Design a binder for these strands. Structure first.
Lengths: 93, 279, 267, 93, 278, 255
DNA sequence: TTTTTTGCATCGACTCAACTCAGCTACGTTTTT
DNA sequence: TTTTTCGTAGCTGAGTTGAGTCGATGCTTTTTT
């Protein structure tokens, strides 16, 4: 069981509500919760299945170095960047 | 264009939340709106039990939603007493139901189940070759004894467990704490039994009434968890005891793996009936 | 026995009576003594006091679709009284009683007694055969091209128009049947012909009367081939259920299916 | 050491960078990290001191029931509401 | 208005990050890496203990200033990741600690005590008594060779002594180059630690005279418990790109074996073995 | 000690020598043999190859503000030479020697020998007194009322002394000593900086602080100090002063 | 010899993405045993 | 007797907040022993 954060942009209302089923929406498109691994993977496939032409980034607490991991769906100008086994964000144009 | 909505495991949920305004559905999410328009989002999929207080009015879609995410809705009155419940209509799976049934119709199997309940509730085995109603005599006696002892660990004026079916202040503060607390327990227990796929009506110690099995299961853990803190709250003579009882019930349910342990409790309780389970 | 379908308002309480309220004020008056079950159709909103009232008089609330083509929520979940469940149960796990219940189901469905030399697993071959025969015969008395009922429950539009019509129809049928079984006070999971799944008995009851009304109108809609056959098959089922009181007549049939157990029923 | 999330809106650039010192910015005004308690209150006092009158919500993993806690600075149309010992968000019209 | 910017504890940070693209600039007061294609990558400089700058990087004045304020040591490295230069907090020394270390260094009795605790912490059993500084450091030489031999044959790696060529880079053995990358990382976090504690990296006890004497002293205590074994582990597979693999292994070791966490207390405990209290 | 202040460009290497680059091309060429210390002023950008070169020839890089009114970062952090740190240390911890230096500092500051009356605690009272006299008299020639919420004049004085601490720290780092190890001032990380700066504070910096207070400001006091440090080679002559202060220590210096 | 050249924050106008809501129109529906 | 009444989702066009950049200007400064 670990803390989970889901950040959405330009996502259809139905996914906003679906995420509001399990998580608490502290900001517009910023959701928070505490879930299991498989609840997280379900939440994810809900995201993938429903984001359409929005873009979502999901991050959760772990045992790793940085202390968390995160994955994305769709395109955003802040992308995860691979750097010596560290995941960081980069801007583009 | 569309995705299924499946209930998440009970051990992974919040035990209960008390509402409230009107419950509506927005974009497929449970929403609580008051008279001033304030919408409050409720993670219904993350709760095992939603207690609806007076002054709430539920839409059709809302009850639908609660059912598909497998959250039990419970309409309660003042003094937080359980009144009505709503959940998944086909929420029973036949193997488990018939298991429970065959366990209920044979009276030897019934007896063993009762004895396992006894040994789980009081810790050490039941006097052998005694019967169901004799066992419930013993259980009555041990119960009063327990109430007395609690009453004098917590220093609360106690004259027995009596309440009234029609008004509100005709009962002692303690009895009220007790009925609110027990209402919460019956909440999560009904949630558990329904989730497991059994029938709340088919009981072994208690029978005949619609929550017999609920009573049976709950009474096993009723004095290990909620009632002591009911007394702890009664000790303080507060103005509005039911909400404090709620909070106390929630932290108790979580601190002691109560949700986590409820389904397995049911399973081994029934497993004491010599017959092998479905899976 | 007695029940009422409410829709398009708020159910609240006045003077201790069930009331259906809209923008025009009180739409439907209901005295507490006259309903055992209230079917809540879409667009309804239940007050707290209404639920309280229902609870005092032991009234079953059931959240349904229109005319009960879908069942969504139920008060008294998991059955209300122990006896109906144990009655049904005892009828189901004993296989002599199970057998007799099955043959009564058979004769209620086909109008003729089942051969005593056959058994349950022997019988369902026979009724299977009659079913293929009936589907064939219905198929183009109404003019719809037929090569048999095949489906895969993982996708919907692979099957031909007639088959998806049939499946919308039978789904609705399962709706009102589940509704009826819930109203009678029995459990949808404990079946006799069908077993194992949570809606076994629903299937059992429903296929008895499936060929009365519902599959024929399924075929009619498939024949004239409109744009959205699913919704019109659903609506047509709804109107059939409403005009022919299907839920109302479903209950006694159930009581007789089970009473065909020689064991005396509850009160 | 627990996972930390900081969501900012309408905050001056200097606070955005100041937060970019310790946390990783996965989306615009959405920062993530894993910090100690005292680092969290330091970051917070940075927020109070630099947000001017934009609005920020900071949430972190905890041992409590919901599994996390969260705090706000400034006004937002999503405010925390106390409900039976649970903090939830509510909207205003 | 603006708020002060103070560094966070070393134990709470990521051990090191290697930067190697374009130019390091400051934006809105944050450490930023920009390449020639415009891609800006933000670096949580305050959350790192060491920023290793590889060739082709160019640091702004404001950047080095920033790194110093958040107390991150900057380290300029070469090919095979060898440490070549460092930058940080100019007044980074604390008077009581500096004088403590110094007076510990000046009389050779205390020096000897300090050296012996270093010995005991490095090898886990007390040092043979009655022996002197150059003698025990002779012993240290012998045991070190024994160690290199032993590691060389557990990991099954051909070993011909520790030799390198300070002119060409690919003139050195695979293993040795791994060893030099690893030792470089360790010197990184060790320098960070010694500077953070407020001591001087130049004032050593076993090693003396050169600017990283104390760094060598401290690091050699824990170098064979942590980094060199995994250096040999990398050397065994003969990868195409040994340097990056060595970094990954070093960070992984530092996090698993509490290295950043225990480095300062190690220092304090080494120096405390020598007489007078802090 | 040789040093060069570089400003508004990129420091890179050409031919194996330090070059300062603009879009206008090579701005300042510097051979490796002529600098021991390179002061990097604001608006500078250091290449990797430049640092590599500096490291090879042992050239000290110091990130400073303009004219070194602020010191921000230093290569070879914590001093680079063991011998000088221990020299200074040894001079500071035993108190007869500490006494040597304090008195040399006294004479460099006031032009008059310190009375043989002495240790360190009795005089910090005297220099305190001579200081009150000096502030008073300076306050009286420039005609300024004499008695961060406060009067303009003291804020001027503090901007000025801050700059002074800047250039002094720069010098101490350039010489190779440690800013923390002081003789008059002790305990604090910049003790020696205070010690050195208070020797030369009054000949230049405080008077023009007063001139600026009279003309009525922190920015202009800072910049005016920048011009003072630049015009009168302050950092350049600070180093020998430090070396001779410490050399007053009975003990022979390093090489 | 008259060599004024750089990095970085602030500010103000502009573009642009996206949230939020109101009024309008459909609809009671995600099925198969 | 001719009783169309409700909740919820999708769509489209408007108000609105806020992020992100460009180009121009100011500055190399967050100080006190």
């Amino acid at each position: 069981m670990s803390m989970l954060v889901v950040v959405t942009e330009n996502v259809p209302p139905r996914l906003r509500g679906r995420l509001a089923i399990w998580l608490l929406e502290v900001r517009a498109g910023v959701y928070v919760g505490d879930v299991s691994a498989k609840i997280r993977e379900m939440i994810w496939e809900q995201i993938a299945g429903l984001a359409e032409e929005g873009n979502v980034v999901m991050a959760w607490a772990t045992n790793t170095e940085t202390g968390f991991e995160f994955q994305t769906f769709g395109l955003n100008r802040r992308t995860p960047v691979d750097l010596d086994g560290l995941r960081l964000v980069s801007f583009l144009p | 264009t569309w995705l299924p909505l499946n209930p998440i495991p009970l051990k992974d949920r919040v035990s209960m939340i008390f509402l409230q305004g009107q419950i509506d559905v927005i974009d497929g999410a449970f929403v609580l709106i008051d008279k001033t328009g304030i919408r409050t989002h409720i993670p219904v999929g993350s709760v095992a039990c939603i207690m609806l207080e007076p002054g709430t009015r539920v839409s059709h879609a809302a009850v639908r939603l609660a059912a598909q995410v497998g959250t039990l809705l419970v309409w309660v009155g003042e003094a937080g007493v359980r009144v009505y419940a709503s959940g998944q209509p086909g929420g029973a799976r036949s193997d488990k139901l018939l298991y429970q049934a065959k366990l209920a119709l044979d009276e030897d199997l019934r007896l063993k189940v009762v004895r396992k309940m006894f040994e789980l509730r009081f810790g050490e085995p039941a006097p052998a070759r005694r019967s169901v109603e004799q066992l419930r005599g013993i259980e009555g006696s041990r119960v009063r004894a327990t109430y007395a002892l609690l009453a004098k660990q917590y220093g609360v004026t106690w004259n027995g467990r009596r309440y009234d079916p029609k008004d509100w202040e005709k009962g002692d503060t303690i009895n009220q704490c007790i009925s609110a607390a027990t209402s919460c327990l019956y909440g999560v227990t009904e949630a558990a039994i329904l989730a497991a796929g059994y029938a709340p009506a088919i009981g072994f110690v208690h029978t005949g009434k619609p929550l017999s099995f609920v009573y049976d299961i709950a009474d096993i853990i009723k004095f290990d968890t909620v009632v002591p803190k009911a007394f702890e709250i009664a000790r303080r003579n507060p103005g509005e005891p039911d909400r404090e009882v709620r909070l106390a019930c929630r932290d108790i349910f979580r601190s002691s793996k109560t949700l986590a342990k409820l389904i397995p409790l049911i399973e081994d309780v029934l497993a004491a009936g010599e017959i092998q389970p479905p899976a």
